[PDB]
Design an enzyme around this catalytic site. Structure first.
Site, mmCIF file in Angstrom:
data_model
loop_
_atom_site.group_PDB
_atom_site.id
_atom_site.type_symbol
_atom_site.label_atom_id
_atom_site.label_comp_id
_atom_site.label_asym_id
_atom_site.label_seq_id
_atom_site.Cartn_x
_atom_site.Cartn_y
_atom_site.Cartn_z
ATOM 1 N N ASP B 379 -17.141 22.888 -14.057
ATOM 2 C CA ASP B 379 -17.713 24.009 -14.788
ATOM 3 C C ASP B 379 -16.687 25.132 -14.885
ATOM 4 O O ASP B 379 -15.845 25.305 -14.001
ATOM 5 C CB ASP B 379 -18.996 24.491 -14.106
ATOM 6 N N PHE B 517 -23.565 43.251 -33.442
ATOM 7 C CA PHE B 517 -22.493 42.263 -33.506
ATOM 8 C C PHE B 517 -23.055 40.964 -34.071
ATOM 9 O O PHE B 517 -24.186 40.579 -33.758
ATOM 10 C CB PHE B 517 -21.880 42.052 -32.124
ATOM 11 N N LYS B 522 -18.319 38.870 -37.330
ATOM 12 C CA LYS B 522 -17.318 39.192 -36.306
ATOM 13 C C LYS B 522 -16.852 40.643 -36.396
ATOM 14 O O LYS B 522 -15.671 40.947 -36.206
ATOM 15 C CB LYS B 522 -16.132 38.213 -36.332
ATOM 16 N N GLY B 655 -21.572 26.125 -19.864
ATOM 17 C CA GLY B 655 -22.698 26.694 -20.570
ATOM 18 C C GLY B 655 -22.359 27.809 -21.528
ATOM 19 O O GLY B 655 -23.259 28.352 -22.176
ATOM 20 N N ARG B 747 -22.256 24.921 -24.574
ATOM 21 C CA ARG B 747 -23.697 25.136 -24.722
ATOM 22 C C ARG B 747 -24.490 23.989 -24.096
ATOM 23 O O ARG B 747 -25.424 23.446 -24.688
ATOM 24 C CB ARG B 747 -24.078 25.326 -26.192
ATOM 25 N N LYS B 753 -25.422 18.346 -18.024
ATOM 26 C CA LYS B 753 -24.311 18.225 -17.086
ATOM 27 C C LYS B 753 -24.467 17.010 -16.183
ATOM 28 O O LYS B 753 -23.468 16.456 -15.711
ATOM 29 C CB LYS B 753 -24.192 19.491 -16.237
ATOM 30 N N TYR B 1054 5.048 2.207 -1.311
ATOM 31 C CA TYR B 1054 4.956 2.976 -0.079
ATOM 32 C C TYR B 1054 5.967 2.501 0.956
ATOM 33 O O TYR B 1054 6.404 3.293 1.792
ATOM 34 C CB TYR B 1054 3.534 2.928 0.482
HETATM 35 C C1 LIG Z 1 2.432 -24.255 14.582
HETATM 36 C C2 LIG Z 1 2.659 -22.753 14.737
HETATM 37 C C3 LIG Z 1 2.947 -22.137 13.369
HETATM 38 C C4 LIG Z 1 3.674 -20.806 13.556
HETATM 39 C C5 LIG Z 1 4.368 -20.401 12.256
HETATM 40 C C6 LIG Z 1 3.527 -20.816 11.050
HETATM 41 C C7 LIG Z 1 3.815 -20.335 9.859
HETATM 42 C C8 LIG Z 1 2.985 -20.736 8.644
HETATM 43 C C9 LIG Z 1 1.500 -20.595 8.969
HETATM 44 C C10 LIG Z 1 0.590 -21.035 8.125
HETATM 45 C C11 LIG Z 1 1.004 -21.686 6.806
HETATM 46 C C12 LIG Z 1 0.099 -21.197 5.677
HETATM 47 C C13 LIG Z 1 0.470 -20.200 4.899
HETATM 48 C C14 LIG Z 1 1.812 -19.506 5.119
HETATM 49 C C15 LIG Z 1 2.314 -18.933 3.796
HETATM 50 C C16 LIG Z 1 2.125 -17.670 3.481
HETATM 51 C C17 LIG Z 1 1.395 -16.721 4.427
HETATM 52 C C18 LIG Z 1 0.600 -15.720 3.591
HETATM 53 C C19 LIG Z 1 0.587 -14.363 4.290
HETATM 54 C C20 LIG Z 1 -0.347 -13.423 3.532
HETATM 55 O O1 LIG Z 1 0.062 -12.790 2.620
HETATM 56 O O2 LIG Z 1 -1.688 -13.310 3.916
HETATM 57 C C21 LIG Z 1 -1.859 -12.927 5.250
HETATM 58 C C22 LIG Z 1 -2.732 -13.953 5.970
HETATM 59 O O3 LIG Z 1 -1.982 -14.584 6.969
HETATM 60 C C23 LIG Z 1 -2.553 -15.769 7.444
HETATM 61 O O4 LIG Z 1 -3.586 -16.146 7.002
HETATM 62 C C24 LIG Z 1 -1.848 -16.583 8.527
HETATM 63 C C25 LIG Z 1 -2.684 -17.817 8.850
HETATM 64 C C26 LIG Z 1 -2.277 -18.969 7.937
HETATM 65 C C27 LIG Z 1 -3.458 -19.923 7.777
HETATM 66 C C28 LIG Z 1 -3.406 -21.002 8.855
HETATM 67 C C29 LIG Z 1 -4.557 -21.984 8.644
HETATM 68 C C30 LIG Z 1 -5.685 -21.674 9.626
HETATM 69 C C31 LIG Z 1 -6.742 -22.773 9.537
HETATM 70 C C32 LIG Z 1 -7.511 -22.866 10.854
HETATM 71 C C33 LIG Z 1 -6.642 -23.553 11.906
HETATM 72 C C34 LIG Z 1 -7.521 -24.399 12.824
HETATM 73 C C35 LIG Z 1 -6.669 -25.458 13.520
HETATM 74 C C36 LIG Z 1 -7.536 -26.666 13.874
HETATM 75 C C37 LIG Z 1 -7.930 -26.613 15.350
HETATM 76 C C38 LIG Z 1 -9.104 -27.561 15.593
HETATM 77 C C39 LIG Z 1 -9.303 -27.762 17.094
HETATM 78 C C40 LIG Z 1 -10.582 -28.559 17.338
HETATM 79 C C41 LIG Z 1 -2.531 -11.557 5.301
HETATM 80 O O5 LIG Z 1 -2.300 -10.977 6.551
HETATM 81 P P1 LIG Z 1 -0.960 -10.038 6.736
HETATM 82 O O6 LIG Z 1 -1.090 -9.241 8.011
HETATM 83 O O7 LIG Z 1 0.269 -10.911 6.811
HETATM 84 O O8 LIG Z 1 -0.832 -9.016 5.451
HETATM 85 C C42 LIG Z 1 0.448 -8.597 5.046
HETATM 86 C C43 LIG Z 1 1.075 -7.741 6.165
HETATM 87 O O9 LIG Z 1 0.071 -7.010 6.827
HETATM 88 C C44 LIG Z 1 2.167 -6.778 5.665
HETATM 89 O O10 LIG Z 1 3.298 -7.527 5.298
HETATM 90 C C45 LIG Z 1 1.752 -5.903 4.470
HETATM 91 O O11 LIG Z 1 1.571 -4.588 4.927
HETATM 92 P P2 LIG Z 1 2.859 -3.784 5.566
HETATM 93 O O12 LIG Z 1 4.146 -4.347 5.013
HETATM 94 O O13 LIG Z 1 2.759 -2.322 5.204
HETATM 95 O O14 LIG Z 1 2.847 -3.927 7.070
HETATM 96 C C46 LIG Z 1 0.451 -6.354 3.784
HETATM 97 O O15 LIG Z 1 0.420 -5.818 2.486
HETATM 98 C C47 LIG Z 1 0.326 -7.882 3.689
HETATM 99 O O16 LIG Z 1 1.327 -8.364 2.826
HETATM 100 F F1 ALF Z 2 -20.058 28.739 -14.470
HETATM 101 AL AL1 ALF Z 2 -20.577 27.725 -15.851
HETATM 102 F F2 ALF Z 2 -21.094 26.722 -17.242
HETATM 103 F F3 ALF Z 2 -21.809 26.928 -14.798
HETATM 104 F F4 ALF Z 2 -19.319 28.484 -16.852
HETATM 105 MG MG LIG Z 3 -19.777 28.489 -12.792
#
Ligand SMILES: CCCCC/C=C/C/C=C\C/C=C\C/C=C\CCCC(=O)O[C@H](COC(=O)CCCCCCCCCCCCCCCCC)COP(=O)(O)O[C@@H]1[C@H](O)[C@@H](O)[C@H](OP(=O)(O)O)[C@@H](O)[C@H]1O
Ligand code: ALF
Ligand SMILES: [Mg+2]
Ligand SMILES: CCCCCCCCCCCCCCCCCC(=O)OC[C@@H](COP(=O)(O)OC[C@@H](N)C(=O)O)OC(=O)CCCCCCCCCCCCCCC
Ligand SMILES: *[C@@H]1O[C@H](CO)[C@@H](O[C@@H]2O[C@H](CO)[C@@H](O[C@@H]3O[C@H](CO)[C@@H](O)[C@H](O)[C@@H]3O)[C@H](O)[C@H]2NC(C)=O)[C@H](O)[C@H]1NC(C)=O
Ligand SMILES: *[C@@H]1O[C@H](CO)[C@@H](O[C@@H]2O[C@H](CO)[C@@H](O)[C@H](O)[C@H]2NC(C)=O)[C@H](O)[C@H]1NC(C)=O
Ligand SMILES: *[C@@H]1O[C@H](CO)[C@@H](O)[C@H](O)[C@H]1NC(C)=O
EC number: 7.6.2.1
Lengths: 350, 1064
Positions: B379, B517, B522, B655, B747, B753, B1054
């Site tokens: 305003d 006026f 005017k 207004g 007006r 508003k 950033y």
């Molecule tokens: C053997 C050991 C391995 C160690 C090394 C392994 C490396 C590769 C790992 C996985 C391969 C898969 C993908 C790898 C490829 C690319 C990774 C993508 C990374 C990604 O951008 O997203 C991330 C998710 O990160 C996972 O989700 C990470 C998890 C990846 C998914 C894994 C799958 C999980 C599935 C469940 C597993 C269950 C296992 C089964 C067990 C069963 C048992 C009964 C998001 O979090 P993030 O903190 O990093 O985000 C980033 C980060 O914070 C920072 O760089 C930025 O801010 P700033 O710059 O300002 O700070 C920010 O903008 C952002 O970029």
């Molecule tokens: F202060 Al006004 F329209 F609310 F000029």
């Molecule tokens: Mg006012």
């Protein structure tokens, strides 16, 4: 200036700070330091795990496979061993049977070298869910202390094994009802000029279980054994058959539940001297059937190491971490050297 | 047609009209809970917590305490309920205070005016309004203390300005002055139904047998206030919620932010994941209990019914896995938002030391929007412009004078015609000595300044006289003549008295006639008689009307005055030319009869009088021109420029009339001369439709160049905006408004508003901020996503009704660039991390259901699982969402485009949320697998052959998970102060010192009897320390390396700014 906010570093959000930055001037030296400090640790752990010499015999199926007359050699899918020397004669077994119908398995093995270390004798169970929800909490902690708990004051966690024929069951729960009741002969009988190796059974469970497990204060006319203890205590307890669970350390060891379906339980040990090379024999009473749970009970003879037993997982994890750090350090170093970033301080898109 | 009787109230009350009952309270003591609980459990987290607490109460399914979740739920519900009750009490107090106003109603019993209250004022009560008391309801005026029913009403509530509005009574009913005659009049009023259009009215009033029409010249609204009048008689027509003031107002809706609307869908997704996990685990459990019936005979499984076990393991797994949507997160978010509001309302750069009124955030649950604003509705007067017009410059005798001369052109170059600036002292010096020729022109100028006006002066007890002017330019002209020496004092009818401080003598001028006026004219002309006995005509008006009517042979200063009107118009100041002429008696004796000829024609009065007056303005002599400025607040143009650089569109709804709004827009650098102003001032629906079609057809045909897009503005009138908001012409206005750079609406009633804001927020998906002052724009503040009220001034209705209250406009910059963006970067992370450290623990409870025959056994003690979210993982979220600055303040103020980082949602969305959840799952799986691999058969200790067990391993899992989440928190932070230094390592040391104390005392007191020997079997073994050293690094190496890569070889904006800050 009555409602004027204060002029302090906290209130104005201008505290003395320190902003870290991930620069190759300090990230690559960190990876180098990690890879230089984690490889010696992993090597030491793998050496300490390899330095452990042990033996394992799956004495299940000894009822049908073993020979009643003379010893026959155990199949290869049941024996494991790791020693500093080679074994000339493989372990064998025999099945002995008493006149009343109780059987026993006699294992006969050989130690090829003097194990100048503390010897421990465990029994191994598999496919036995000691960590089931209906099984971990099923025991009354007041009867373990010896308090004569009444029938109504008995914990409900023993709901299936809680009082029978209007009589309180002294060892509450399913943990005591299903107990491993195979008895290992407390001596390794040496064969052919081999001296006997005397084991021991005292001080096995935790030092705190020999303080909470105390002799009961019940009277035998009030309590009745569990359904699976009736063969040891036929027709109930008496004034002499009543056991004191303060020195019955097998009960203490069995009550301390395990976290995995495959676990060890300490049964015998010796720490006074070593067992020289030679042929030994161990007798094992065959009471606990494996058809109850469908697993494999086994006799294990081990020593002790820095991390306990023969396990490479810790050193392997250390080496994996060190290798990943070194690999990525080399990758980042070559990417930095052969491809400079040249980002620029005032290069921005606003 | 509403029919109203004038005298008999008991006869006209049969129709069932209102009773002046106003209601601003939502809740009462009869239906508070059935609505509060409905609006509280309409969310999703509340329903989830309710279901969890209802299921957790049955005995054989709960692994944790039964009263913690429901206890905290009831606590937060009580807090919200008491806050709502306090707000409702605040509303009811104001409603009762307004209802307890002492009115004066004409009672037939006493047959006189008695002092009753605003309540029970029925339709037809002939009421009396005194000096400065506000109007009780919609009242048609009947008479007043003025000679011909005239009266002045201030309309600061239904409009925005404090200029006196003229109303008058009909000539057939302006004779009832005394009260004893009011009992004689009768008849009926046929008026329109209750509407919301303020500036329109129609109706008929039938007295004895003759009827008179009605118009907004007689209709007085409830929001007005009589001034400069002793008393008025008014017949009430509308009352209560039927008056045109409080019929347009709307209730206060519930405001939700974008983060909340994302959190709802995240909660839906997490509930679906939870149902999937529960179904998988229950199917596995029932399949295993049906298959391995023989090998599970040592558990004495019942097996009596399948459903009786399934519908119980379902509940057990629900209670075991429901930690994915915790309540500690939903209380820490509120605590963080409250502390952020406290920090915002505590900055010196937002403190206005003139009125000693710092800013206050009256609603913290909206601070997260301060970083994603796209539109700004404002305003005019009070927020942008101070309601202070000032006479700045005059130009007479070919010269020009100001008091504060600037040093850029103080040297008058005398380039032929004089151009430059001289002091008012040299004006008084060429006024004092009589030898100069211009001094009769200078004093005739200063008398045209101090006499031609229509200002009503008033004295105070201090002696400083205050002028009440119906127009602020005439009042600034009077104050300009007053501080120069010609003070304007007591004004009686048909004469003007002037106190002269130069000589000390008090003069007087006999006012013969003034012509009013007119926007078509005017002009303003006034014939006067002097102490000389001479008749002089004074006339003030724009140059485009009087410059046609001069004698160029007579005056010699036209070339100086047209250039002074050109450099005055080059600064956007409002200008007026002043003309005069001596007249003779014979032409005045004829023009008086021509004026009484125009007084004879009552059939035609708008057309007859003014052109009968224009017979005598055939020739004038120009004195010069004046310049009145309308000064703005300090820092308004800089803030407008910064907010437009940051990518925020700025509208102006006001207004006022059109010309002053356009002048203000030009002055504050919101508009420009090259900007093509698409002015829409049509008066009908079809005409507005045709205008919109023409505009859009001329715009879409040409190529929209960047220069053409930047140099394009829109100006709408209220009568045309009343049709451009219909469902048909809505899209046309929307598509022609989005192409422009700035939109102005003139007006505009208080309802429009808010209608404009509703239309913009429905036809789009962008966040809106509305800043204002006064009451008329309160309905606006209620409609926008964020509301800001100007505080520190009288009548702080907005400062109480708005979500945020600021001292002035120039702070709106730092409120949005720094504190606005910071907030959006903080709380967002503080939410995502809260969904991480939780999952990264409790997902272990899932990976264990495959190692225990799908039973549901937990690996940690219940009290430790409860203490996880209370003592060891509560400080990182606060130190991240409060004391974390991802970029300095000066760099946020220097580069406004960084604001766009929060404007498009680059810090909080479903993608990053799922990324955090998957990272938590990965860390949980890593911890579980590593721990079960290190503790294979429990044989992991070197203490005389003794083995570990269940709890001695659960403790290691718990410690590892805590260290990992603390390491992740340490990686997320940008700056490390002191709270960050004692909030992330501090929690680690806290746990490492608290566990040996909790496990060596509480077991003795029968509190968690599982930790009887865990201290020795964990802190006394090397495998525990080695796992603690080697597993968190293995889990965080991936995050460390990805952070390094992202900040080195693929940076964001950033990131570059932080790199600038670190070194430079
Ligand atoms: C053997 C050991 C391995 C160690 C090394 C392994 C490396 C590769 C790992 C996985 C391969 C898969 C993908 C790898 C490829 C690319 C990774 C993508 C990374 C990604 O951008 O997203 C991330 C998710 O990160 C996972 O989700 C990470 C998890 C990846 C998914 C894994 C799958 C999980 C599935 C469940 C597993 C269950 C296992 C089964 C067990 C069963 C048992 C009964 C998001 O979090 P993030 O903190 O990093 O985000 C980033 C980060 O914070 C920072 O760089 C930025 O801010 P700033 O710059 O300002 O700070 C920010 O903008 C952002 O970029
Ligand atoms: F202060 Al006004 F329209 F609310 F000029
Ligand atoms: Mg006012
Ligand atoms: C060593 C020196 C430092 C020591 C410091 C120690 C830290 C002190 C401690 C300071 C902490 C300040 C509050 C920060 C969050 C607290 C945790 C929380 O609030 O969470 C609710 C619940 C946990 O729930 P869950 O685990 O997340 O999941 C459900 C799970 N139980 C299940 O079974 O389903 O907690 C409880 O129930 C017991 C505590 C109740 C507190 C009620 C709120 C207080 C408001 C307070 C409001 C105050 C006024 C606010 C306005 C000014
Ligand atoms: C060593 O432990 C095993 C494992 O529990 C014991 O085997 C079980 O012993 C009980 C006690 O007699 C048997 O219960 C009986 O079952 C028959 C049906 O076969 C029933 O008719 C009886 O009334 C009684 O309930 C149980 O069958 C048997 N086997 C299993 C798998 O539980 C064994 O007795 C223990 N031996 C010693 C010496 O402690
Ligand atoms: C550990 O085993 C050794 C070897 O058998 C035990 O030492 C012998 O114990 C027997 C039984 O008392 C004695 O008759 C022998 O004389 C001992 N050997 C020697 C060389 O003196 C030792 O006692 C065992 N320690 C235990 C069971 O704690
Ligand atoms: C040593 O072993 C022999 C044969 O097994 C046994 O008789 C003797 O009791 C053992 N010694 C002790 C102290 O038990």
């Amino acid at each position: 200036t009555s409602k004027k906010p204060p002029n302090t570093a906290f209130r104005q959000q201008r505290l003395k700070a320190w902003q870290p930055i991930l620069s190759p001037q300090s990230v690559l030296p960190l990876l180098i330091f990690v890879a230089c400090i984690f490889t010696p640790i992993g090597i030491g752990l793998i050496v300490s795990a390899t330095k452990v010499q042990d033996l394992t015999i799956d004495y299940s199926h000894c009822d049908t496979k073993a020979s009643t007359t003379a010893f026959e050699d155990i199949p290869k899918k049941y024996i494991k061993y790791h020693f500093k020397s080679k074994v000339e004669n493989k372990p064998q077994w025999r099945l002995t049977e008493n006149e009343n119908g109780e059987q026993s398995c006699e294992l006969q093995f050989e130690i090829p070298n003097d194990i100048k270390k503390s010897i421990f004798i465990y029994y191994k169970i598999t496919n036995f869910y000691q960590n089931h929800r209906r099984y971990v909490q099923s025991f009354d902690t007041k009867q373990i202390l010896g308090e004569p708990i009444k029938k109504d004051d008995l914990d409900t966690s023993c709901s299936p094994i809680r009082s029978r024929e209007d009589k309180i069951i002294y060892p509450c729960g399913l943990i005591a009802n299903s107990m491993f009741n195979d008895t290992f002969s407390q001596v390794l009988s040496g064969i052919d000029d081999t001296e006997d190796y005397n084991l021991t059974n005292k001080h096995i469970s935790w030092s705190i279980d020999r303080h909470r497990f105390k002799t009961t204060k019940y009277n035998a006319s009030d309590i009745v054994p569990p359904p699976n203890w009736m063969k040891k205590y036929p027709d109930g307890y008496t004034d002499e058959n009543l056991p004191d669970i303060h020195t019955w350390e097998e009960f203490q060891v069995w009550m301390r539940t395990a976290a995995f379906p495959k676990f060890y339980k300490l049964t015998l040990k010796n720490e006074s001297a070593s067992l020289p090379k030679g042929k030994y024999q161990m007798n094992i009473e065959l009471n606990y059937p494996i058809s109850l749970f469908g697993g494999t009970k086994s006799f294990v003879l081990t020593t002790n190491g820095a991390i306990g037993g023969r396990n490479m997982s810790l050193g392997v994890l250390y080496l994996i971490v060190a290798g990943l750090c070194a690999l990525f350090g080399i990758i980042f170093l070559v990417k930095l050297i052969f491809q400079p970033r040249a980002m620029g301080d005032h290069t921005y898109l606003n | 047609p509403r029919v109203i009787h004038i005298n008999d109230s008991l006869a006209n009350s049969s129709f069932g009209y209102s009773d002046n009952h106003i209601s601003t309270t939502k809740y009462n003591f009869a239906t508070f809970l059935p609505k509060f609980l409905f609006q509280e459990f309409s969310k999703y987290a509340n329903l989830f917590f309710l279901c969890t607490s209802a299921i957790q109460q049955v005995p054989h399914v709960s692994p944790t305490n039964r009263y913690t979740t429901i206890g905290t739920l009831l606590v937060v519900l009580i807090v919200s309920a008491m806050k709502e009750c306090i707000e409702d009490i605040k509303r009811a107090n104001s409603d009762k205070e307004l209802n307890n106003s002492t009115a004066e109603i004409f009672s037939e019993a006493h047959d006189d005016f008695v002092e009753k209250r605003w309540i029970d004022i029925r339709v037809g009560d002939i009421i009396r309004v005194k000096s400065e008391e506000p109007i009780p309801a919609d009242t048609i005026i009947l008479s007043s203390s003025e000679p011909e029913g005239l009266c002045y009403i201030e309309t600061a509530n239904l409009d925005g300005e404090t200029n006196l509005k003229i109303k008058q009574s009909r000539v057939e009913t302006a004779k009832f002055i005394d009260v004893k005659t009011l009992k004689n009049m009768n008849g009926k009023v046929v008026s329109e139904q209750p509407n919301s259009s303020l500036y329109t009215y129609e109706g008929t009033m039938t007295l004895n047998d003759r009827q008179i029409p009605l118009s907004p010249d007689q209709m007085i609204l409830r929001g007005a206030t009589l001034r400069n009048t002793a008393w008025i008689f008014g017949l009430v027509i509308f009352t209560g919620h039927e008056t045109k003031l409080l019929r347009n107002a709307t209730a206060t809706p519930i405001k939700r932010t974008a983060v909340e609307k994302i959190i709802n869908r995240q909660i839906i997704a997490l509930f679906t994941v939870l149902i999937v996990l529960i179904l998988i685990s229950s199917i596995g459990n029932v399949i295993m209990s049906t298959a391995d019936a023989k090998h599970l005979s040592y558990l004495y499984l019942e097996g009596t019914n399948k459903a009786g076990l399934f519908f119980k393991d379902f509940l057990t797994f629900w209670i075991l896995f429901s930690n994915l949507v915790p309540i500690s997160l939903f209380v820490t978010v509120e605590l963080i938002k409250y502390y952020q509001a406290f920090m915002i309302g505590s900055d010196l750069d937002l403190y206005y030391e003139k009125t000693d009124t710092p800013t206050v955030v009256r609603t913290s649950s909206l601070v997260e929007e301060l970083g994603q604003i796209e539109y700004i509705f404002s305003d005019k007067t009070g927020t942008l412009t101070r309601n202070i017009m000032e006479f700045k410059s005059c130009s007479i005798a070919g010269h020009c004078y100001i008091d504060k001369i600037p040093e850029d052109k103080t040297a008058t170059v005398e380039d032929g015609i004089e151009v430059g600036y001289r002091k008012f002292d040299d004006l008084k010096k060429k006024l004092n000595d009589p030898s100069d020729e211009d001094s009769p022109i200078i004093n005739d100028f200063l008398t045209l300044l101090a006499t031609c006006h229509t200002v009503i002066p008033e004295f105070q007890s201090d002696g400083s006289i205050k002028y009440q002017a119906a127009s602020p330019d005439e009042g600034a002209l009077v104050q300009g003549g007053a501080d120069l020496g010609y003070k304007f004092i007591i004004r009686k009818p048909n004469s003007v008295t002037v106190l002269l401080e130069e000589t000390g003598e008090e003069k007087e001028y006999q006012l013969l006639n003034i012509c009013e006026f007119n926007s078509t004219r005017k002009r303003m002309s006034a014939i006067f008689r002097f102490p000389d006995g001479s008749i002089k005509l004074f006339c003030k008006g724009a140059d485009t009307v009087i410059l046609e009517r001069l004698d160029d042979e007579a005056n010699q200063y036209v070339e100086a005055t047209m250039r002074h009107l050109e450099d005055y118009a080059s600064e956007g100041l409002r200008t007026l030319c002043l003309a005069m002429r001596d007249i003779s008696e014979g032409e005045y004796e004829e023009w008086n009869s021509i004026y009484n000829e125009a007084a004879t024609t009552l059939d035609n009065r708008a057309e007859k009088l003014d052109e009968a007056a224009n017979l005598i303005e055939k020739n004038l002599i120009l004195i010069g021109a004046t310049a009145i400025e309308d000064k703005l607040q300090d820092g308004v143009p800089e803030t407008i420029h910064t907010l437009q650089e940051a990518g925020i569109k700025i509208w102006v709804l006001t207004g006022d009339r059109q010309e002053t709004a356009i002048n203000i827009g030009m002055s504050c650098r919101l508009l420009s001369e090259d900007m093509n102003l698409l002015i829409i001032n049509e008066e009908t629906r079809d005409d507005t439709e045709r205008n919109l079609l023409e505009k859009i057809n001329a715009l879409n045909e040409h190529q929209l160049s960047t220069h053409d897009m930047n140099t394009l503005a829109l100006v709408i009138d209220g009568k045309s905006l009343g049709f451009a908001l219909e469902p048909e012409l809505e899209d046309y206005l929307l598509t022609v408004a989005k192409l422009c750079k700035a939109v102005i609406c003139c007006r505009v009633s208080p309802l429009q508003k808010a209608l404009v804001v509703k239309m913009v927020k429905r036809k789009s998906s962008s966040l809106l901020l509305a800043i204002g002052d006064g009451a008329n724009d309160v309905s606006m503040i209620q409609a926008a996503h964020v509301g800001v009220g100007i505080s520190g001034m009288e009548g702080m209705q907005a400062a109480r009704s708005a979500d945020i209250a600021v001292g002035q406009f120039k702070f709106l910059k730092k409120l949005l660039l720094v504190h606005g963006s910071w907030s959006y970067q903080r709380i967002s992370v503080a939410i995502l991390y809260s969904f991480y450290k939780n999952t990264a623990l409790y997902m272990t409870q899932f990976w264990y259901v495959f190692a225990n025959a799908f039973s549901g056994q937990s690996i940690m003690e219940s009290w430790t699982m409860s203490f996880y979210n209370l003592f060891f993982t509560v400080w990182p979220p606060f130190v991240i969402g409060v004391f974390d600055q991802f970029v300095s303040s000066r760099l946020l103020e220097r580069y406004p485009q960084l604001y766009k980082l929060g404007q498009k949602g680059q810090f909080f969305s479903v993608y990053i949320f799922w990324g955090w959840i998957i990272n938590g799952f990965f860390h949980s799986a890593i911890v579980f697998i590593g721990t079960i691999l290190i503790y294979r058969y429990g044989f992991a200790l070197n203490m005389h052959g003794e083995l570990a067990d269940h709890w001695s391993w659960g403790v290691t899992v718990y410690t590892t998970s805590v260290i990992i989440v603390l390491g992740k928190a340490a990686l997320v932070t940008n700056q490390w102060t002191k709270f960050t230094l004692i909030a992330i390592p501090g929690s680690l040391l806290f746990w490492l010192i608290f566990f040996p104390i909790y496990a060596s005392i509480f077991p003795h007191a029968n509190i968690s009897r599982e930790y009887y020997g865990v201290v020795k079997h964990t802190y006394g073994s090397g495998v525990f320390w080695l796992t603690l050293i080697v597993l968190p690094i293995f889990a965080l190496v991936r995050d460390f390396l990805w952070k390094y890569y992202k900040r080195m070889y693929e940076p964001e904006t950033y990131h570059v700014i932080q790199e600038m800050q670190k070194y430079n």
